[PDB]
Amino acid sequence: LVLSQNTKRESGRKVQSGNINAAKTIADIIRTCLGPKSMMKMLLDPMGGIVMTNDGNAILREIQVQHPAAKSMIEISRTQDEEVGDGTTSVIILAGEMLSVAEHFLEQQMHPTVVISAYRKALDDMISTLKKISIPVDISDSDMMLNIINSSITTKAISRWSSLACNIALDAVKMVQFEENGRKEIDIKKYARVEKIPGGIIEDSCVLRGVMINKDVTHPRMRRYIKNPRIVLLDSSLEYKKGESQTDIEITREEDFTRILQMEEEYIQQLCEDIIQLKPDVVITEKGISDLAQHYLMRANITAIRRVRKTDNNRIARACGARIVSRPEELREDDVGTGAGLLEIKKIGDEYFTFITDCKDPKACTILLRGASKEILSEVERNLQDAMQVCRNVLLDPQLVPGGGASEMAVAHALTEKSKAMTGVEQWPYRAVAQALEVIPRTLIQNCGASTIRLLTSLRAKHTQENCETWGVNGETGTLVDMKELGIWEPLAVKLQTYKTAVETAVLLLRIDDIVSGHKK
Amino acid sequence: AVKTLNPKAEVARAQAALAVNISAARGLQDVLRTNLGPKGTMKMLVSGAGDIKLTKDGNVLLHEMQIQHPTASLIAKVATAQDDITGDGTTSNVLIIGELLKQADLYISEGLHPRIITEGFEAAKEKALQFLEEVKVSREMDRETLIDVARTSLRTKVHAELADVLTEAVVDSILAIKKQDEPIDLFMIEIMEMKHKSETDTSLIRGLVLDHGARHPDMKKRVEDAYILTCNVSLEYEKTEVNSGFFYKSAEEREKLVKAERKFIEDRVKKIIELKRKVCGDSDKGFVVINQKGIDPFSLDALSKEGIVALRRAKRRNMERLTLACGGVALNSFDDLSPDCLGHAGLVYEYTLGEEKFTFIEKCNNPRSVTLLIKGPNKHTLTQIKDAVRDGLRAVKNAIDDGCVVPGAGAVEVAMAEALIKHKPSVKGRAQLGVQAFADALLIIPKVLAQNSGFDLQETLVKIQAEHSESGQLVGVDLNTGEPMVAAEVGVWDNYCVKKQLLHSCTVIATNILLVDEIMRAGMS
Amino acid sequence: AVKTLNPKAEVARAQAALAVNISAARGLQDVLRTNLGPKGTMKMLVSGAGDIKLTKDGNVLLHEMQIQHPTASLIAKVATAQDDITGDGTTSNVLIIGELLKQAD
Amino acid sequence: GVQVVITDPEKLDQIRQRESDITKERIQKILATGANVILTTGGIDDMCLKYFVEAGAMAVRRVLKRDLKRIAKASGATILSTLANLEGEETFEAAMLGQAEEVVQERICDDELILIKNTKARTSASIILRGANDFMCDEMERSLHDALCVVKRVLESKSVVPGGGAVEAALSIYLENYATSMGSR
Amino acid sequence: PKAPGFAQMLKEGAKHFSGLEEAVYRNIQACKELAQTTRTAYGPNGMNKMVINHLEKLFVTNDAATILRELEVQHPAAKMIVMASHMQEQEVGDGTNFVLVFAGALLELAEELLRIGLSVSEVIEGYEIACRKAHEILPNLVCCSAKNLRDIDEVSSLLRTSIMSKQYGNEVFLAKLIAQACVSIFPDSGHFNVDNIRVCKILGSGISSSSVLHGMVFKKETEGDVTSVKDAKIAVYSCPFDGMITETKGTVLIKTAEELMNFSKGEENLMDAQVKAIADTGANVVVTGGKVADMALHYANKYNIMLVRLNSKWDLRRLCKTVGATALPRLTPPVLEEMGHCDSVYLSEVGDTQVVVFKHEKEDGAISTIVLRGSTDNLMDDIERAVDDGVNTFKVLTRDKRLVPGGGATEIELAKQITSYGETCPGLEQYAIKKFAEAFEAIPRALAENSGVKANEVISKLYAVHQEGNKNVGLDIEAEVPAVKDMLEAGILDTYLGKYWAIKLATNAAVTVLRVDQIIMAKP
Amino acid sequence: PKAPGFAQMLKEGAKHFSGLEEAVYRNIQACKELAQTTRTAYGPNGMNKMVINHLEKLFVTNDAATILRELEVQ
Amino acid sequence: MPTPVILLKEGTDSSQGIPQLVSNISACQVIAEAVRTTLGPRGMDKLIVDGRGKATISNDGATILKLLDVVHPAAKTLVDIAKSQDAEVGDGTTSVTL
C-alpha cells in the first residue's frame, strides 16, 4: 500500500480515446437541437420540476455526469451562453466534432502539441477570415435589427411570435443606455427585469414603460390610480428601530412609562412630517412600515409600499430616475419621484400588481410575460434572454456575419487555400479542422432531413466560386441559399467566441494524458 | 446513448416518449371526461390523511389526483392557470388537449412529421379565433342574461335546485358589486361557511358576518342600531420597543407602578369612550368596535361597564369589506378621532353556533361589500359548493367583463368545425391534414356531452351536423334529449375569453407537446 | 371484483384489458414492421447462451424475442402455424393484425 | 460593554440621533476633503451608501487586505485603520489620499470588476485573464505565477543558464572525468 | 403468464375505483355494515354496548353517534353517513340510532333497483321528490302539541321516552329530576341553553340516590374555614389572590437600610389593607382559579373569609352567572352591585370526595347542577349521556312545538302515505319511491329485532290496524304480546323536528353517497 | 420525475437496441476495440502477447486467432 | 390492482352475542376466585408484587383488585365497584365482588 489507497489512475491513448469518445457522446446528445428545424427538449430536474427548452446550455446546465471532460465541456457551454447566449445551439456540436476528427491523428502517432500548434494558427486565420467577410450595419435602423433579431430568433418556439419579441427585445434594449460614462454608456440586462405571469396569451405580454410590482397598497385609503405621482424610495425601515447600543431605561416615576410610549409615537410621527414636507405621493421601502405612520401617510393620502426587493427598488429608482434614501431628514428633492407618467395597481386575477407607466425617458424596464404556464413562460424568456443579449452585442459591434453555414464554408476553403500553401506535416491538421467546420450546415441538413452529402458537396462546389459568399443553407427548404435575400444574419462577435471557444476546448482536452481520482480534501 | 454518460440516468426516444406522452393524456382525459356537462358526475377524493372531496372541477382533481407522469403535471399547471383564469372548462380544456393529441397521433402514426401539423394548427386556430371573434354575442348586463349564464355555469356542479337557489345570490351580488367600471371580487365577496341546518339555505347576506364573537358575557349579543369602529391598533397591553428596565423602592410605588403601566391604554380606550359618549349620547344607539389585533380584558371591562361592543383579531382584509360595508373610516390613531370617521349599521347581532361564535352585520343603506355565508350540512359539501361558487362568480366577472358572450354547450365547436372544415388547402396542402384533425378534435365537447348523457355519439353529431339554412344556426346538443338546440334561445351561454383563452392555451400546449423527443432524467442522488 | 375471491389474483376490465391488447399488438407490430421487404433489414438476436441470429423472418424473431404479454404469445402461436403453413407474410399477418385493431380502436 | 441606561427619557431621541451622526460626520469629514474613491475591508452601511450617492462618490466594502496594501503602495494612499491626529481629535488629511488617472468598474464576463489605471505615485501592473473554462484560467495563472518568479529571479540574479537540458549533458562527462580524481570507491 | 398490462401507470400506489362496481357493490356493502354494526342499538329493548378506543379507554354506550365517534372508520362513504348523523346529533341529539337505520334501508333498498337497472340519477329524483313529499305529509301526524312551559308533570311525561329510549331501567327518577332541571332553569340568557345545565359524576351510592341541586358544585378543596351563610357574600376574581404583580419587572432596589424594614412591612401592610377593603364590603367568600398569596389568605382567615382555587375559565364563567355577580380582574374594588349573593355555600363530603357546595335558591332563574350517584363511572358517562340527550330533547322540545307519535307508528303512516303517493306518480321512478316508502319499515322491524319477536306479522298487523287511521297505536314493548300498543295513551311520542330533520339528513346522506360513481384513494 | 413511461413493456429484462445508434456508434466501437486489441499483433516487428484463460492456463501468442480463441467476448 | 375497502382498522376486533357475553361472565367468575378466599373472620389475604419489585400484601380485595391490573374491560367495572364501595363503606368490598 503506497500511493493514495483506492484512487484510480489511467494514462495515455486509452485516456485519449476515452475523452475523445465522451465528447462525441457529449456533442451527439444535442445534435438534434440546432436550426430553425430543430427539436425541443423537456427535462426532469432531480427534485420533480419540469423544464422544456431548446437552448443547449440549460440542457447541459441540467446534466449530471461522471466523466470530467463532459463537465469540462459543460462549463464551456454555459460560459459562451453567459457571454453570448446562443450559438450554444451550435458551439459544442462544433466542439466535439472538432475533437472527433482531432483524434484521427492520434493513431497517426502525431504529437498533439503540433496539432495544437496548427490549431492556434488555424483560429488566427479564422478570425481574420470572418473580419474579412463581416458586414457592419447601422444601429439606428430598427427594421434590420428586427430582421436581425428574427434572424436571431427564428430558431426557437417563439418563432410564431417573432414580430412581438423583436420589437419587445429592441425597445427594452434601446431604453437602457447609461450615459454618465461619457459616450461610453453601457446597457444592463439585470435592469432588464423579466416578469412571467401565466394566463392570458403571448399577444397579451408586452413591454411596460416602467416597473411591475407583485405587491399591494398597504392601506385601502391610498388611491390605486394616479397620473403623475411622486415616489419615495426609503432604504431604511419606516418604524422604530433598535437603539443599537443595548440601550436600557430605568424609570422610577409613574408618568415616565406612558411618556416614553408617546415618544416612540412621537419618533414615528417625526418621520412622517419629514416625508410630507417634500409633498411626496408614493412611498416605497424594502423594510416594514408602521401602520401608525401609515395612518399618518394615509392621513396625508400618500401611497405607501413596504418590504420591496432591493433590485426592484433600484429599477424602480431607475424607472422614475429618483434615488433611494435611508434618511427622511436628509431626503433630498432632487430624488422626488418625478418621471412618473401613470400610477396604478391592477388586479391580475388573485394578485394585485403595481403599475408604473410613462416615465419620460425611463432607463429601467421590466418585460411582462403573460402566457399559458410558467414552464412555457420560462422557456420563452430564455429565448428572450438570448434575443436581447445578441442585440446588445449588436449594440456592442455593428459588424455582422451571414450564418447558415455560409461563412463556415468560406473559411473552410480559405483554410484550404491556406492549407495547400502551408506545406509541412502541420498541413494535414490544418485541412482537418477545415474538414471539421463543414458539419454544421451538414447538421442543419439532418434537422431538415435532406440529402446531406450531395447538398454539401454542391455547397462546397457552390462556394468554390469566389464571386459568392452569402450562399448558405435554408432552414426549411434544405436548399442552397444566398443569405442576402434569406436574411438570417448574425453578430460577428457571436461567431468569434464561437470559434474562439471551440478551439480553446480542443487544446485543453488534447494536452490531457492522465486521470486521477479520490483526492480526499 | 447518454446512458454511456450516466448509468443511473434514464432517457426515452423520439418515437418512444412521443407515444408515452400521448398515452399519458389519453388516459388522463379518459377519467376526467365523465365530469363536464350538467349530467356529469362530480368525484370524491380521500386523502392519505383521510380528508374527503366531492368535487367535479378537474383542476381540483388534477391538483389532488397524485400522478407522476410529467406531461400531466405540465397540463395540470395550465389547468390551474385556467382555474386562476376562469374556473371551469378546465374540464373541457384537458379534454380538448389529449383528444387533439390523439387525433394528432393518427397522422404521425402515418409517419407524418409533426412540425407540419403544428403549422396547420397555427393556421387552424387563427381562422377559428377569427370566427371566434366575430361570433360572440354582444349582450348587456341584463340581470336575466347573466342569471341564465350563472344557471348555465352553476348547473355544471350541483343540483338543478341548488344552483337555482345559488343563482339569485351571486348575480345580485354582482349587481351590488360594480362601481360600474372595475371588479376585484376579493373584498365585496366574503365567502364564509357554517355547518348549519342545510345546504340550500346558504345565502347572500346584505350585510357581513364575522368568524368570531365578543369575549365577555355582558357583551351585547344584539344591537338595533350599530355605530361602527374599524381599527387595527392593539388595545391589548404593550411594552415599548426599547429595553426599559424599571425598578421601584416601595410596594406603594409597586401599585403606583401598577396604575401607571395601564394608563396609556387607559387613555386609548378613554378617547373612544368619550367619542362614543360624544357620539352615542342617545341610549338607543349601539356602538360596535372592530380590531385586527387583540384587546385587553381590562379594556374589555372598560367597554363592558359602558356596554360597548368591540371585536379583536380580524383578518387584514375584513376591514376593507367593513369600509365597503359601513363607510367607516378605518384608522390607527385615536387622538385624531372624529365622528365622521365612524361607520354606521342598521342592525347587528351575533350568531352563536356549535362552539364558535359568528357575528352579523345588517342593514347598510348602500352596502358595497356583501357576504356569501355558506350554510352547510356537511363539511366536504361546504368545500364542495364553495368551488362551485367561486367558479360561478368568476364566470360572471368575465361575463360582465366582456360585453359579449358565447352561447355554450359546444354549439360553437360545430360552428368551429364547419367553418374550419370549410377551409380549402389555401394552406400548403399538407397542413390541411392537421387542420382537418384540429377541426376534428373540436367536436369532442358535444361528443362527450352525448357520451356523458349516454346518447349514442356518432348519430347525434351527424344530426347536429346540419347547419339548417342561410340561418345555419348556432345549434346546441340537447343535454337531456340529445337534440339540436338554440343555446341562445334556451339561454345557454359562456364567457368569450373563456372560449378565447382555452383555444389559445390548448394550442400552445399542443404544439410544444408534440415537439419533444426524449424525456431526460439524469439528476444527483 | 374477484379480488374479493382472491387477493393474489389479478384481473383487468373491459376498457382496460381491451386497451392492453391493442397496445400489445400495436407495440408488437411496430417492432416487426422494420422487417419485411427486400429493402427491409434482418435483425440479429442474441441468446442468453450467447447464440446469434441474422434473420428477418419474424417467426424466428417472435419465437425468439421473449415477451410476456399473452396476446403477443397468442400471436406467436397462430404465426407459428402460418410459418408452418407458408413462412413469409407471417410478417404481414401481425402487421395486418395490429393496424386492423388500431383502426378498430 | 458600555450600557446605556435611561432614567430621563427626554434625550433618547438625541441619543439615538447621534448614534449614526458619528458615522455621518465621519462621512462628512472625509467627504469634505473631496476624496472621490475609497475602500474599506470593513462593512459599509447603507446610510453611508446613500450619503455617497448624494456625493456621487465611489466606495468599496470588503476588499481583501493585501490588495489595498498594494493599492496604498500603488496609488500613494495611506491605508487608514481609523481617523485620528497627533492631537486627540480624529482628523483627516488630503495628504492621506491615493492618486491615479482613472478608475472604472467594468463588467467582464457580465460581471463588473473595478479597474485602476496608472497610479502616479507608484506604477502598478495587473493582468486580466481570458479563457474558455474556469479550469483553463486557474492553471494558466499558475504558469503565470511561475512565469513571474523565473523572470524575477533573472532580475534577482543578472545571470542565465541555457535551457533544454544542457546542464547534465555537460555535468555528466565533467563529473565522469572528475570521478577518476578521487580514486576511492 | 403472470404478466397483465396497465394502460394507466398514473398512480404511485393508490386505489382507483371505477365501473360502478364498488358503487353498485362495495359502497353499498360498507353502509350495510354500519346498519348491522348498530342494528341492536335503537329500541327501548335495544341494548347498550361498550368499546375501548385506540387508547384503550372504556366507553359503554347506547348512543350510536358516540360509538361512531369512537370508530376510526376508513371507507369514504361510511364516514359521510357517520358525519351526517354526527351533526344531526349536534343538531337534535338522539336520532343517531334512527338515521343510521334510515341510512342503510334507503341504501339497502336502493342497490336492488340499481341492480334492477333504474337510472342512478332517477334514483336520486324519486328519492328526492319522495322526501320532499314525505316532509310535506309529516306535520299532518302531530298530536298532543303540549304547551305548558314550566310545569313538571307534562314535560316529564314527554321527556320520559328519550330516557326510556336509551335507558329502560330507571325512567321515573331520571325524568323528574331532569324535569326538575328544565323547570329550575328559565329563559335567562335566552331560552334554556343546553350549556346552562351542569353534570357531576360521583361514583358510589347507586343511581336512585342521585339528585339535582338548585345551585352548583365543586369537588374542590378550601384553604381557610368552612361556613355557609343564609346571606352569602361571594367574591369573584379572575385575578389571582396576590399583590398585583406588574407584568413587567419591578424588582425592589434599595439604596439605604430602612427600606428593608419598611418594604416587607408595608408589603404586609397594604395586603392587609387590600383584604380589609374587601372585608369592609362584607364579602365572606372569595373565588378564583388564580394564584393565592399566603399572607392574603392568611389575612382572609384573619377576617373569617372563604376562598376558591384553581378553577378553570369555564368554572368562573359558570359561577359568575350563578349569583349573577361579575368577576373582577381588578383585585381591590369589592363592588356592592357586582357582588356575589347566594342562598348557602359550604363543603360536602360525598363518596369520599371533597366537594364544595353552592346550595342556592334562585327565583330569578339559575343554572342548577345535577348530582350523579352510583358505582361505575362508565355508568355515569352514559347515564349523563342519555340525560344530556334528553336535555336537548327538552330544548328541541323547547325549540318550537308539536309532539308527534313515536314507537314507529308515525313511520307506518308515512310508508302507507308514501306508498299511496307512489302509485300516483306513475313512471319508471314509481318503484324507487315505492321502495322509498318501504324502507321506513326498518324502524319497527329493527324494533322487533330488538324486541326479538316475529316482525313481519306484527308489521302486517300494524299495517292492518293502520288501515283505519289508527295513528296513535304502534308497536308494543312486550314478550307476552308481540302485536301492538297505542302510543298516545302510552305517551310514546317524539319530536316533529327530530323526525323531520333526520328524514332530510338521511335523504341528503343518500343522494350524496348515491351520487358518486368512481373513486380515488391515495396511500395514507 | 422518477417515473418515465414505457410504450412497450414487451421485455422481461433484456437489451433491445435501435435507432442505428449502436450500429452507427456501438457496433463500430466494439470493432474498433478488436483492432486496438490486435493492432500490434502481426509483424516481424509485431511482438508476441500472452493471456491467461478462464482456466488459468498460459498462452504466449503472436497468432491472432489463437489468442482470439482465448477471449470470451460478449 | 383493486382491493375491497375494509370497514374499520385492521385487527379492530369484534365478538358478539352469547359466546361474547358469556366470556365476561366467566371472566367475572375468574375475578372472584382471586378474591374468593378473602373476606371472613377466618378469611384470606393476598400478596402481589409489582413488576417494579415492590411487594404489596392486602386483605382488602379492592386494594388487591387495584393491584390486579385488569386488561379485560367488563372486569374493570367490577374493579370500579370496589372503589365506589371502598369509597363508601370498606371491607365487604370483598363480598361485593362475590
- HEC sequence for chain D: CCCCEECCHHHHHHHHHHHHHHHHHHHHHHHHCCCCCEEECCCCCHHHHHHHHHHCCCEEECCCHHHHHHHHHHHCCCCCCCCECCCCCCECCHHHCCCCCEEEEEEECCEEEEEEECCCCCCCCCCCCCCCCHHHHHHHHHHHHHHHHHHHHHHHCCCCCCCCCHHHHHHHHHHHHHHHHHCCC
End-to-end Cα spacing for chain F: 34
Distance CA D131, CA D136 (A): 6
* Longest pairwise C-alpha distance within chain C: 54
User: Which position has the grid cell 408614493?
Assistant: A282
**B258 Cβ under 8 Å from any chain A Cβ:** no
Which residues of F fall within a CB distance of 8 Å from A103?
Answer: none
Element (H, E) at B44: strand B44-46
Check if the beta carbon of residue B69 is closer than 8 Å to that of residue E10. yes
End-to-end Cα spacing for chain G: 56
> DSSP 3-state assignment of B331?
strand
> In the annotation, is B86 catalytic?
no
> DSSP 3-state assignment of E424?
helix
Between chain A and chain B, are at least 3 CB pairs below 8 A?
yes
G17 is in an annotated binding site: no
* Range(s) within chain E of domains with CATH label 1.10.560.10: 24-145+402-521
**Hey, what CATH topology would domain E24-145+402-521 get?**
GROEL; domain 1 (1.10.560)
Q: What share of chain A is helix, strand, coil (3-state, %, to 5)?
A: 50, 15, 35
Chain interruptions in chain G, by residue before each (C–N > 2.5 Å): none
C-beta atoms of F4 and B10 within 8 A: yes
Partnered with residue E355 across adjacent β-strands are: E348
List of residues 6+ apart from B73 with CB closer than 8 A: A50, B67
Which residues of C fall within a CB distance of 8 Å from E4?
Answer: 10, 12, 17, 20
Which residues of B fall within a CB distance of 8 Å from E90?
Answer: 195, 354
Q: Which of E9, E10, E11 to mutate to test the interface with F (most CBs of F within 10 A)?
A: E9
Between the alpha carbon of residue E55 and those of residues B422, E37, E58, E389, G9, the distances in Å are 72, 21, 9, 26, 14
> DSSP 3-state assignment of C98?
helix
**G85 Cβ under 8 Å from any chain E Cβ:** yes
- Do strands E232-236 and E285-287 pair parallel, antiparallel, or not at all (unpaired)? parallel
Q: Which of A18, E224, E167 is nearest to F33 (CA)?
A: A18
Q: What is the resolution of this structure in A?
A: 6.2
Shortest distance, CA B24 to any CA of chain F (angstroms): 8
Distance CA A261, CA A11 (A): 77
Shortest distance, CA E3 to any CA of chain C (angstroms): 6
Nine-digit cell at A372? 399559458
List of residues 6+ apart from A288 with CB closer than 8 A: A237, A238, A239, A306, A307
Element (H, E) at A483: helix A483-486
Q: How far is CA B115 from the centre of its chain?
A: 37
Check if the beta carbon of residue E455 is closer than 8 Å to that of residue E448. yes
Between the alpha carbon of residue A67 and those of residues A26, A184, A484, A485, the distances in Å are 10, 44, 43, 45
C-beta atoms of F10 and C50 within 8 A: no
Shortest distance, CA D109 to any CA of chain A (angstroms): 6
Side chain identity at residue D129, one-letter code = L
G60 is in an annotated binding site: no
Q: Which of E203, E207, E353 to mutate to test the interface with G (most CBs of G within 10 A)?
A: E203
Shortest distance, CA A323 to any CA of chain D (angstroms): 8
Chain F residues whose C-beta is within 8 A of a chain C C-beta are 7-12, 14-15, 74
Distance CA B211, CA B199 (A): 19
Q: Which of F25, F33, F39 to mutate to test the interface with A (most CBs of A within 10 A)?
A: F25
- Do strands A399-402 and A135-136 pair parallel, antiparallel, or not at all (unpaired)? antiparallel
Check if the beta carbon of residue G40 is closer than 8 Å to that of residue G98. no
User: Which position has the grid cell 350510536?
Assistant: E64
Q: Which of A419, A457, A420 is nearest to A126 (CA)?
A: A419
Q: What angle do CA E251, E254, E256 make, to 5 degrees?
A: 170
Would you give the DSSP letter of residue G12? Answer: -
**Hey, what CATH topology would domain D1-156 get?**
GroEL (3.50.7)
- Point out the residues of A that are catalytic: 55, 88-89, 386
**Hey, what CATH topology would domain B140-206+368-403 get?**
GROEL; domain 2 (3.30.260)
Between the alpha carbon of residue A254 and those of residues B376, E263, E264, F4, G87, the distances in Å are 54, 19, 21, 73, 57
C-beta atoms of A504 and D132 within 8 A: yes
Which residues of C fall within a CB distance of 8 Å from B15?
Answer: 30
Q: Which of E254, E280, E295 is nearest to E332 (CA)?
A: E280
Distance CA E501, CA G56 (A): 58
Range of the domain at A343: 211-368
B89 is in an annotated binding site: yes
Distance CA E27, CA G4 (A): 10
Annotated catalytic residue within B55, B71, B86, B91: B91
Q: Per-residue b/e over C7-18, b at no fewer than 16 CB within 10 Å? A: eeeeeeeeebee
Shortest distance, CA C74 to any CA of chain B (angstroms): 24
Distance CA A515, CA F49 (A): 26
For C99, the closest chain B residue by CA position comes to B109
Phi, psi angles (nearest 5°) of residue A115 = -55, -40
Determine whether E85 is exposed, middle or buried from the number of CB atoms within 10 Å of its CB (0-12, 13-18, 19+).
buried
> DSSP 3-state assignment of A230?
coil
Element (H, E) at B447: helix B444-453
Chains in contact with A, where contact requires at least 3 CB pairs less than 8 Å apart: B, D, F
Nine-digit cell at D2? 458600555
**E22 Cβ under 8 Å from any chain G Cβ:** yes
Q: Which of B22, B17, B18, B35 is nearest to B100 (CA)?
A: B22
Q: What angle do CA B322, B327, B328 make, to 5 degrees?
A: 70
Beta strands in A192-318 (DSSP E): 192-197, 206-207, 212-213, 225-226, 231-234, 248-249, 282-285, 303-305
Which residues of F fall within a CB distance of 8 Å from E5?
Answer: 9
Nine-digit cell at B371? 357576504
C-beta atoms of E203 and G73 within 8 A: no
* Number of other residues whose CB lies within 10 A of the CB of residue D152: 10
Angle between helices E171-184 and E377-399 in degrees, nearest 10: 50
Distance CA A450, CA A456 (A): 10
Which residues of C fall within a CB distance of 8 Å from E5?
Answer: 12, 17, 20, 23-24, 69
Between chain C and chain A, are at least 3 CB pairs below 8 A?
no
Distance CA A406, CA A468 (A): 10
HEC letters along A282-305: EEEECCCCCHHHHHHHHHCCCEEE
Shortest distance, CA C70 to any CA of chain G (angstroms): 18
Number of residues in chain F? 74
DSSP per-residue string spanning E42-108? SSSS---EEEE-TT--EEEES-HHHHHHT--B-SHHHHHHHHHHHHHHHHTSTTHHHHHHHHHHHHH
Q: Which long-range contacts (CB under 8 A, 24 or more apart) does B471-477 make?
A: B472/B418, B474/B135, B474/B407, B474/B411, B474/B412, B474/B415, B475/B411, B475/B414, B476/B407, B476/B408, B476/B409, B476/B410, B476/B411, B476/B446, B477/B409, B477/B410, B477/B411, B477/B446, B477/B449, B477/B450
Q: Which of D67, D55, D56, D6 is nearest to D28 (CA)?
A: D55
C 8-37: CB under 8 A from B: 15, 23, 30
Would you give the DSSP letter of residue B55? Answer: B
Residue E5 — left, alpha, or beta (φ > 0 → left; ψ -120 to 50 → alpha)?
A: beta
Nine-digit cell at B126? 387563427
Residue ranges covered by each domain of chain D: 1-156
Count CA within 13 A, CB hemisphere, residue A508: 26
CATH number among 1.10.10.10, 3.30.300.10, 3.30.450.30, 3.50.7.10, domain E215-365: 3.50.7.10
Check if the beta carbon of residue A214 is closer than 8 Å to that of residue A197. no
> In the annotation, is B34 catalytic?
no
Partnered with residue E232 across adjacent β-strands are: E342
Check if the beta carbon of residue A216 is closer than 8 Å to that of residue A306. no
Distance CA A285, CA A337 (A): 13
Q: Which of G1, G5, G10 to mutate to test the interface with C (most CBs of C within 10 A)?
A: G1
G 3-22: CB under 8 A from C: 3-4
Distance CA B499, CA B505 (A): 10
Partnered with residue E307 across adjacent β-strands are: E286
Residue ranges covered by each domain of chain B: 11-139+404-520, 140-206+368-403, 207-367
Between chain F and chain E, are at least 3 CB pairs below 8 A?
yes
**Hey, what CATH topology would domain E146-214+366-401 get?**
GROEL; domain 2 (3.30.260)
Annotated catalytic residue within B55, B71, B86, B90: B90
The answer to whether the Cα torsion of A300, A301, A303, A306 is positive or negative is positive
The answer to whether the Cα torsion of A272, A278, A279, A285 is positive or negative is negative
Distance CA A493, CA A410 (A): 17
* Inter-chain contacts counted by CB atoms under 8 A, chains E and G: 63
Side chain identity at residue A283, one-letter code = V
CATH number among 1.10.10.10, 1.10.560.10, 3.30.9.10, 3.10.180.10, domain B11-139+404-520: 1.10.560.10
Angle between helices A492-510 and A374-396 in degrees, nearest 10: 100
C-beta atoms of A254 and B256 within 8 A: yes
Check if the beta carbon of residue A520 is closer than 8 Å to that of residue A13. no
Q: Per-residue b/e over C36-63, b at no fewer than 16 CB within 10 Å? A: beeeeeebeeeeeeeeebeebbbbbbbe
Side chain identity at residue B447, one-letter code = K
> DSSP 3-state assignment of E223?
coil
> In the annotation, is B91 catalytic?
yes
> DSSP 3-state assignment of E254?
coil
Distance CA A35, CA A446 (A): 10
List of residues 6+ apart from E209 with CB closer than 8 A: E373, E374
